[PDB]
């Protein structure tokens, strides 16, 4: 989401006060606060956000780059940037951290695909 109207009942990933580090999403306010306090590492928060933001059927046919053996859709890039910003504001992730978090997201998408077979 670039705007509040995209998800009127949702939340901002990142910080609403920063136009360059915010992405509107479908997660409701109380659920976002639950994720904040229950997901105690950046990796756990990333993977939990992924399950709130992308249906498992979408995860099964997607990955970050949109590449695979018979094609994969890219996970929505603006939403992924929103995850990055959200993790930065909560945990202070570095570039190295983010690369690894991306590896964990891609592994989760591969697991979603395997579970369907
Ligand atoms: Br990004
Ligand atoms: Cl809150
Ligand atoms: Cl778990």
Author numbering: 207 to 323
Original authors' sentences:
pmcThe BEN (BANP, E5R, and NAC1) domain is a ∼100-residue protein domain found in metazoans and viruses, but missing in nematodes and urochordates. There are nine BEN domain–containing transcription factors in the human genome, i.e., BANP, BEND2-7, and NAC1/2.
We then carried out crystallization experiments and solved the structures of the BANP BEN domain in the apo form and in complex with the palindromic DNA by using the short and long constructs of the human BEN domain (aa 208-324 and aa 208-347), respectively. In the BANP-DNA complex structure, the extra C-terminal region after the helix α5 in the longer construct is disordered and unresolved in the structure. The structures of the BANP BEN domain in the apo form and the DNA complex overlaid very well with an RMSD of 0.68 Å over its 101 Cα atoms, suggesting that the DNA binding did not cause significant conformational changes.
